């Protein structure tokens, strides 16, 4: 039976669970080909990479499996959402710019239906819009590199002098008009594609908090987190489970805590008043109300809309895109505001995002160190203010209107602006101490100033920022490597599986694979409860009851049967 | 072969051979390979430095014109702020080197106007492209050899 097995290899899927017998058991099922085809999507793979990096790095071993199941539940959502896709200086400048661009690209009633037809096109190709936005920013900045200023019009006039060629002048206008549009398209695509994910995540988290805890009924709201408070404005809406599957989750909370507490209070907090109507709805039949298309559609939950808008604006990625919008719009103010876009995009290739994040990764000590430097420089300023007045001058003949020692403010500014820079402390920018008075009382001042705020303090500050970037690189390398020496499911490493050739590939490709469970979770959904086998219902019951004992966690079919099968 | 042959063109082309050979003792071949061992991030970092210097150039082009001059009496034909190209070249060629940013090669900000609007410019220029960016670039090449 080799041929049939080979044909059916890419469909059968093995997982391993334990339970009700305190021993490891095997499971088998069929993986629908459409799910496998939709598994290798550009968004899904990167989401998996981000999830695994977050889980391994941010500490686990206690909530790890819970986060795994949560990620499965979320990824099912955009697996669903993917359905809606059915149809001289110039010579140097050009050479250098082309090199920079090349490496970046190497690593970078019935009439209303047409509106949806055109709008669904944006979601299909969204990344290319951002690519085009970066390209337009690059081109417009390179064109900007040719400006000039004259004291008279061709009162200063920013007249743009092109080269001998008279072209490329209106190209700036057309590109400026085009960039705003191709960024607004990005905004619309994001508003159409990604926000369902975050909305669904928040809805699911709130539903879990209400079902398995009484944080909003039993004890008290946390009243200390904006996320934990802004959500109080949606509990009263009639359409709270807009995107989560459990669209009748309101029943569970009242059935679990509506007796120990005021049943009327519970049935009034969650909206849905007069629960008698809800109970009696499923008594006679299911009536079909007449459609009110384009007549009463205006009547929508104002509270829910406000809460959704708050969730939208509290996000960071959408806010960043809106910032891009506003800067692009302000660009048409006849200015260089287009020069602030390259940045935001340039930081797209990680190896630069890690550098940008290293600045604020360890800033909590950086600000203290900066303050310490400031107070030390101030200490030296007050030391030298009342002792060394006659030295701080700029050596002007026959008159000295400039003295950086008279006022304390000017002296402090002069020290903080000159002494820190320079090579060597304030011994290179003031009068020579060759005079007999205070010579040995100022040589030591110069030496200790050069030794305490230049060769130590600045060294420490430079060390803090540079070392944090190294730490980030090490963290990424470790998160890449650790997963290559463990299984993320088994509680054991590769050493014991390496006693046989290709042992780890065998333990990761046909046994628990971190993807077989993905197919298992949505395979359980399709098959009705009446057809579940003797184990499918077993795991499904715990999954609905949120108990993760069925993951192996320590041994996978081999430690149990070493003697019988070696 | 071809460089040796071109050497007989009555030139110093023989001065380009020592190199290739000098790098025969490993302890130097590893140094030569360290430059391109981790270049995939080195080029990105260099690009980041270039865009930051350009950002400062456009910031100071339309605000601090009257400072960038070479202090010639009775005439100032040389102004490194008029054209964007010359200003960018001047920044990228002078400011990066030097000890301290562009505060040692331009006019004093002692004038009342924009004094506090340029002291911070000098300080942040010295802090963002000298004590961090160049430090990172030097660190990348040296650490790869290690
Ligand atoms: N329990 C595990 N589940 C999955 N992969 C594992 C496991 N343990 C180790 N690995 C390693 O991880 C690899 C797949 O995970 P990874 O995150 O690298 O996937 P990827 O980036 O999509 O690409 P590729 O599958 O080609 O490696 C396996 O080929 C194997 O080398
Ligand atoms: Ca049955």
From Swiss-Prot, chain A:
Intramembrane segments per UniProt: 409-428
Modified residues (Phosphoserine): 395
Residues that hold ATP according to the record: 45-49, 483-488, 508-514
Signal peptide annotation: none
Modification sites for Phosphotyrosine: 392
Motif Selectivity filter per UniProt: ranges: 423-429
Subcellular localization(s) per the UniProt record: Sarcoplasmic reticulum membrane
Stretches assigned to the Lumenal side: 332, 386-408, 429-448
Record-annotated membrane-spanning stretches: 126-146, 170-190, 309-331, 333-349, 365-385, 449-469
Cytoplasmic membrane side: 191-308, 350-364, 470-566
Entry comment describing in which tissues the protein is expressed: Detected in skeletal muscle (at protein level). Fast- or slow-twitch skeletal muscle.
Residues binding caffeine, per UniProt: 245
Record: residues binding Ca(2+): 530
UniProt modification remark: The N-terminus is blocked.
Function: Cytosolic calcium-activated calcium channel that mediates the release of Ca(2+) from the sarcoplasmic reticulum into the cytosol and thereby plays a key role in triggering muscle contraction following depolarization of T-tubules. Repeated very high-level exercise increases the open probability of the channel and leads to Ca(2+) leaking into the cytoplasm. Can also mediate the release of Ca(2+) from intracellular stores in neurons, and may thereby promote prolonged Ca(2+) signaling in the brain. Required for normal embryonic development of muscle fibers and skeletal muscle.
Domain comment, as recorded: The calcium release channel activity resides in the C-terminal region while the remaining part of the protein constitutes the 'foot' structure spanning the junctional gap between the sarcoplasmic reticulum (SR) and the T-tubule. Pore opening is mediated via the cytoplasmic calcium-binding domains that mediate a small rotation of the channel-forming transmembrane regions that then leads to channel opening.
Similarity section: Belongs to the ryanodine receptor (TC 1.A.3.1) family. RYR1 subfamily.
Miscellaneous note of the record: Binding of [3H]ryanodine indicates that the heterozygous channel is activated by Ca(2+) concentrations 4-fold lower than normal. Single-cell analysis of cotransfected cells shows a significantly increased resting cytoplasmic Ca(2+) level and a significantly reduced luminal Ca(2+) level.
Subunit structure and binding partners: Homotetramer. Can also form heterotetramers with RYR2. Identified in a complex composed of RYR1, PDE4D, PKA, FKBP1A and protein phosphatase 1 (PP1). Repeated very high-level exercise decreases interaction with PDE4D and protein phosphatase 1 (PP1). Interacts with CALM; CALM with bound calcium inhibits the RYR1 channel activity. Interacts with S100A1. Interacts with FKBP1A; this stabilizes the closed conformation of the channel. Interacts with CACNA1S; interaction with CACNA1S is important for activation of the RYR1 channel. Interacts with CACNB1.
Listed name of the protein: Ryanodine receptor 1
Organism this protein belongs to: Oryctolagus cuniculus
Species classification: Eukaryota, Metazoa, Chordata, Craniata, Vertebrata
First and last residues shown, out of full length: 4167 to 5037 of 5037
């Amino acid at each position: 039976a080799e041929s049939i097995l080979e044909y059916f290899r890419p469909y059968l899927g093995r997982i391993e669970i334990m339970g009700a017998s305190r021993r490891i058991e095997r499971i088998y099922f069929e993986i629908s080909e459409t799910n496998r085809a939709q598994w290798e999507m550009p968004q899904v793979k990167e989401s998996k990479r981000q999830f695994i990096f977050d889980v391994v790095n941010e500490g686990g071993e206690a909530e790890k499996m819970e986060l795994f199941v949560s990620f499965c539940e979320d990824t099912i959502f955009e697996m669903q959402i993917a359905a809606q896709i059915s149809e001289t200086a110039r010579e140097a400048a050009t050479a250098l710019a082309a090199l920079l661009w090349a490496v970046v690209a190497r690593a970078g009633g019935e009439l209303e239906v047409q509106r949806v037809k055109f709008l669904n096109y944006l979601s299909r190709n969204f990344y290319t819009l951002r690519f085009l936005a970066l390209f337009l920013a690059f081109a417009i900045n390179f064109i900007l590199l040719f400006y000039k200023v004259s004291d008279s019009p061709p009162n200063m006039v920013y007249y743009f002098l092109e080269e001998s060629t008279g072209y490329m002048e209106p190209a700036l206008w057309c590109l400026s008009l085009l960039h705003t549009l191709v960024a607004f398209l990005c905004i619309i695509g994001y508003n159409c594609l990604k926000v369902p994910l975050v909305i669904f995540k928040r809805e699911k988290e709130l539903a879990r908090k209400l079902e398995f805890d009484g944080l909003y009924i039993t004890e008290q709201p946390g009243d200390d987190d904006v996320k934990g408070q802004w959500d109080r404005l949606v509990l009263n809406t009639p359409s709270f489970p807009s995107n989560y599957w459990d669209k009748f989750v309101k029943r569970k909370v009242l059935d679990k805590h509506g007796d120990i507490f005021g049943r009327e209070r519970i049935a009034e907090l969650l909206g849905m008043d007069l629960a008698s109507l809800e109970i009696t709805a499923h008594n006679e039949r299911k009536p079909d109300p007449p459609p009110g298309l384009l007549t009463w559609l205006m009547s929508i939950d104002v509270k829910y809309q406000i809460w959704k808008f708050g969730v939208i604006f509290t996000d960071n990625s959408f806010l960043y895109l809106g910032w891009y919008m506003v800067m692009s719009l302000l660009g048409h103010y006849n200015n260089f505001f287009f020069a602030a876009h390259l940045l935001d995009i340039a930081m797209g290739v990680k190896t630069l995002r890690t550098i940008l994040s290293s600045v604020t990764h360890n800033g909590k000590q950086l600000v203290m160190t900066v303050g310490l430097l400031a107070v030390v420089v101030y200490l030296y300023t007050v030391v030298a203010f009342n002792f060394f007045r006659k030295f701080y001058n700029k050596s002007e003949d026959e008159d000295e209107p400039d003295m950086k020692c008279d006022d304390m403010m000017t002296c402090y500014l002069f020290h903080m602006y000159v002494g820190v820079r320079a090579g060597g402390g304030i011994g290179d920018e003031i009068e020579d101490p060759a005079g007999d008075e205070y010579e040995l009382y100022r040589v030591v001042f110069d030496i200790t100033f050069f030794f305490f705020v230049i060769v130590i303090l600045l060294a420490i500050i430079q060390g803090l920022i540079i070392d944090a970037f190294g730490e980030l690189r090490d963290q990424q390398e470790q998160v890449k490597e650790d997963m290559e020496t463990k299984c993320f499911i088994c509680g054991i490493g590769s050493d014991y599986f390496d006693t046989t050739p290709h042992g780890f590939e065998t333990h990761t490709l046909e046994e628990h694979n971190l993807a077989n469970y993905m197919f298992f979770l949505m395979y359980l959904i399709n098959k009705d409860e009446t057809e579940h086998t003797g184990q499918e219902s077993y795991v499904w019951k715990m999954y609905q009851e949120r108990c993760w004992d069925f993951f192996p966690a320590g041994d996978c079919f081999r430690k149990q049967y070493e003697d019988q099968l070696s």
